[PDB]
Design a protein around this ligand. Structure first.
Ligand SMILES: O=S([O-])[O-]
Ligand SMILES: O=S([O-])[O-]
Lengths: 321, 321
């Protein structure tokens, strides 16, 4: 008698969505993911103050104006959590670039390369890292550049529209994190339907559509559903390549013993009604704009993560100067 | 003396409509049309002669249906524009298909085609303002049209300060910052459902833009557009131009309350702000910081595209079996 979590692993690679690395091992995941918000929350926990202190000391030691010291400390902090996480898992860890760079391709490429150098400085090879980038047109092209010119593997996040998914596939990025929960959020707030059956959940439908397109046309980019509101959405996506889940929902799955069966499959994808398209910049911007939810959620997701960066740098600034 | 006549002493009045048979009633200087107003006008019995002419025009040019329908809709836009000019002493704004909002080159070309059609109808480009969505691409399209072809543009769907700055640096002839749709967003997204004139978020937006423009000496004409009540309009007295619907113009004519200008070049000199420059990436970032603007620009584009599609359908149904 296996838990829903153990069954899910038979059809999908499980990933833990958190910076709270002490809570990861209980769920024995393959990979783990962090983001500006998760790092901010973890950096505020007593259990991880030594990391914050080490980040602060690193920035101070290198010296320079506040801007320089803060950049060194916050990037070092992101890397320290990443390194501790890698010690708890056999796979990769995702680390996100400051969201304030989302519309600056060259800055994201540089920041991504910088994070990789810091990991190396910490004794971690790039093969165990996934750099997360906002899926704006600039972010996707940054990903294509990182992959093709530097062998730096990326995780394209805040992916809501089909246009973003297509752009990422064409970019040849290592992995994508199409959101589920925030899509449900939008529909509940912007439509008369406040509740859905698992397979009818708009976020579930989005990942399903993206998964089928990718598998049908043979794109190698890994599909990892992300952001969940309930276990129903997660179960409805079993069969998906990867799924990153919060410790809370992972706990629910570990306690649940009902039977699970995959809803997604490569074979079912090959017979789907997907139609291959190609998007240059202007085609992408138009198609993305046709998806109101995606426009608003990508935009808000960027503002929120930037706010988490600002808040984290403030917390550091008040302890460094 | 009516509020309308008082307003004219501080601001140049513009009529927002395609219903030219009565567009000289409030003696406006300029006139503005958009995909929605043309669609509405084209369905009016009084203007069927123009529609039939547009239809006959597209057919004579030949080519596939898609080409005849395009030449017909463009001919129609120009036909209305030409009729409006016979009734007013100023300019008339004609908008480019919103479906081209992210295609700089296509907007430039379509604008040149419209100017060519006007020339055929015996209208010089001096009587014309080509309306373009204020996306980065639309703004650069306006810049190219002004500098390379001497074609004057009216940048519309302008919601954020970032768009305003971008238009100013592009040196476009005129901008149409919105007021009413900004109120709409705040009413729907905040707890405050009513605002006194100077507190109206749409009024504040145009005020910020006007003061910035006049303070730093930009020549771009500021024309407040989109109004929900006369309170917003009066609160912007002093603005270079104001385009108002025939309905609200009637209300101003019937209103006999005393009006005082709220905006002036002199006062703008002491307004609080620093001059900034925006390259593409800086623009995209600053624009994204304005949630209301991101959402309204995006939706405004979808809405006008929907109007173009509905107008094309109406024509195809009358041009082909
Ligand atoms: O990413 S949170 O919205 O699930
Ligand atoms: O443009 S209409 O929403 O005032």
């Amino acid at each position: 008698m296996e838990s829903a979590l153990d069954q899910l692993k038979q059809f999908t690679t499980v990933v833990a969505d958190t910076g709270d690395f002490n809570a990861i091992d209980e769920y024995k995941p393959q990979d783990a993911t962090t983001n500006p918000s998760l790092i901010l929350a973890a950096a505020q926990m007593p259990a991880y103050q030594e990391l914050v202190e080490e980040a602060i000391a690193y920035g101070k030691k290198l010296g320079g104006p506040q801007e320089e010291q803060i950049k060194n400390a916050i990037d070092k902090l992101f890397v320290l959590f990443g390194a501790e996480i890698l010690k708890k898992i056999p796979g990769r860890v995702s680390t996100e670039v400051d969201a304030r760079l989302s519309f600056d391709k060259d800055a994201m490429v540089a920041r991504a390369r910088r994070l990789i150098e810091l990991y190396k400085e910490a004794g971690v090879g790039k093969d165990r890292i996934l750099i997360k980038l906002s899926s704006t047109w600039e972010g996707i092209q940054a990903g294509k550049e990182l992959e093709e010119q530097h062998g730096i593997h990326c995780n394209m996040t805040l992916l809501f529209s089909f246009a973003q998914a297509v752009a990422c596939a064409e970019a040849g990025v290592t992995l994508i994190s199409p959101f589920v929960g925030r899509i449900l959020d939008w529909h509940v707030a912007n439509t008369d339907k406040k509740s859905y059956e698992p397979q009818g959940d708009p976020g579930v439908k989005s990942v399903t559509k993206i998964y089928n397109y990718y598998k049908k046309f043979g794109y190698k980019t890994i599909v990892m559903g992300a952001s969940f509101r309930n276990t129903g959405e997660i179960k409805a996506l079993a069969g998906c390549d990867f799924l990153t889940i919060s410790p809370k929902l992972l706990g629910e799955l570990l306690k649940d013993n009902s039977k699970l069966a995959p809803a997604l499959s490569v074979k079912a994808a090959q017979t789907s009604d997907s139609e291959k398209i190609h998007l240059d910049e202007k085609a992408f911007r138009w198609l993305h704009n046709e998806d109101q939810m995606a426009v608003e959620k990508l935009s808000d997701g960027i503002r929120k993560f930037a706010a988490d960066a600002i808040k984290l740098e403030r917390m550091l600034t008040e302890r460094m100067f």
